[PDB]
Amino acid sequence: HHVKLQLVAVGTKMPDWVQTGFTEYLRRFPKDMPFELIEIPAGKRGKNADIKRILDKEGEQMLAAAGKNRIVTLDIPGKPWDTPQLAAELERWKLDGRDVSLLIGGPEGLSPACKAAAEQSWSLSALTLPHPLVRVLVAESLYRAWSITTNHPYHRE
Amino acid sequence: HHVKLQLVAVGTKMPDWVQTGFTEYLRRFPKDMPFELIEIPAGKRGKNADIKRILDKEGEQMLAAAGKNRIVTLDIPGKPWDTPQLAAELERWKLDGRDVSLLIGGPEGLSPACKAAAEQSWSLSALTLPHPLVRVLVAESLYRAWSITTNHPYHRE
Numbered sequence: 233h234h235v236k237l238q239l240v241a242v243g244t245k246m247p248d249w250v251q252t253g254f255t256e257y258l259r260r261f262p263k264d265m266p267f268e269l270i271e272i273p274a275g276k277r278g279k280n281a282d283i284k285r286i287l288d289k290e291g292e293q294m295l296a297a298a299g300k301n302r303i304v305t306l307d308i309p310g311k312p313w314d315t316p317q318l319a320a321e322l323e324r325w326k327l328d329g330r331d332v333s334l335l336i337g338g339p340e341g342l343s344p345a346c347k348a349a350a351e352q353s354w355s356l357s358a359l360t361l362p363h364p365l366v367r368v369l370v371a372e373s374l375y376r377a378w379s380i381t382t383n384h385p386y387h388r389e
Numbered sequence: 390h391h392v393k394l395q396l397v398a399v400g401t402k403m404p405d406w407v408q409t410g411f412t413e414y415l416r417r418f419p420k421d422m423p424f425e426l427i428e429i430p431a432g433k434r435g436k437n438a439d440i441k442r443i444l445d446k447e448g449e450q451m452l453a454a455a456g457k458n459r460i461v462t463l464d465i466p467g468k469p470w471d472t473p474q475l476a477a478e479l480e481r482w483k484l485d486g487r488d489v490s491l492l493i494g495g496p497e498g499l500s501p502a503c504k505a506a507a508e509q510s511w512s513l514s515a516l517t518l519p520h521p522l523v524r525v526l527v528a529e530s531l532y533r534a535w536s537i538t539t540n541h542p543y544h545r546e
């Protein structure tokens with residue numbers, strides 16, 4: 233009865249250094265808090281493409297991936313959680329008992345349906361961050377939040 | 390070479406993926422806005438060490454590297470600039486004409502003198518970020534800010 237953290241993200245080819253950095257954090261998560269990545273393919277964009285519909289198809293794929301999971305969106309206008317707050321949230325998710333889906337939008341951001349479906353929305357920064365860096369920050373900050381919950385040396389070194 | 394952006398940062402041994410990611414951004418700044426790294430070595434800490442002094446000695450070195458430059462600290466309680474705001478600031482630094490020293494603290498954070506010396510302070514996140522990731526986020530966000538000022542393709546879509 234341990235909870236799963238699922239990063240649901242649009243885009244499939246992280247630069248090598250980003251994937252290396254992401255894996256170094258992902259792998260340090262304990263067996264009772266598995267951290268896993270689900271990549272959704274980005275819709276093909278063009279001037280002749282209807283951008284709303286491309287975005288909705290992306291969102292539909294994300295929400296389908298989340299299933300019945302608790303839905304948390306990564307979004308610039310979400311809650312600017314500090315590290316103690318994220319640790320408190322991480323603890324709340326565990327009591328809740330449901331797996332958590334963390335949603336990272338593609339180039340055009342999150343679909344309206346995804347923003348609407350969010351039970352919580354989490355802002356990493358007031359800055360517009362590139363999708364690969366969002367992946368790494370989420371992994372690192374959750375790791376730091378987790379290490380606070382178990383008094384692991386990482387959060388205090 | 391009108392204004393130079395110099396990152397003054399405590400710590401010397403970045404993980405490889407971090408140096409790769411950091412350089413990837415650094416090498417893309419144009420010759421007329423050079424982005425450079427100055428590393429101050431971290432003081433050797435021990436449970437018998439005077440942290441107050443170690444911190445002062447780090448700051449002393451930082452402030453020496455900055456010289457007469459515009460001094461901007463990276464600090465959690467600084468200004469939570471969004472990306473357009475950072476572009477405007479970058480534009481204001483160019484008008485000022487002074488090179489900009491961007492200060493990143495060591496394991497114990499910035500010295501009292503460095504915080505005192507700051508003309509501006511810049512917050513990347515409400516999160517407690519690890520020193521390597523601060524380096525990468527500063528390089529990318531300034532690169533994105535630069536690309537906005539020059540109507541470069543990086544920041545669009």
Ligand SMILES: C[S@@+](CC[C@H](N)C(=O)[O-])C[C@H]1O[C@@H](n2cnc3c(N)ncnc32)[C@H](O)[C@@H]1O
Nearest residue numbers: 306307308336337341342355356357359360361
């Ligand atoms: C390049 S951004 C596109 C942002 C989009 N134009 C918007 O305003 O919603 C791609 C995705 O990364 C995530 N992201 C980028 N910056 C973020 C931030 N500062 N805080 C939280 N999530 C962020 C969001 O999930 C976003 O959908």
Ligand SMILES: C[S@@+](CC[C@H](N)C(=O)[O-])C[C@H]1O[C@@H](n2cnc3c(N)ncnc32)[C@H](O)[C@@H]1O
Nearest residue numbers: 463464465493494495498499512513514516518
């Ligand atoms: C290990 S952190 C220390 C965290 C915290 N600022 C402190 O004083 O203990 C090292 C440095 O990274 C920078 N830093 C960490 N998180 C930051 C954030 N969210 N925004 C801007 N700078 C940050 C600060 O310059 C800090 O001195």
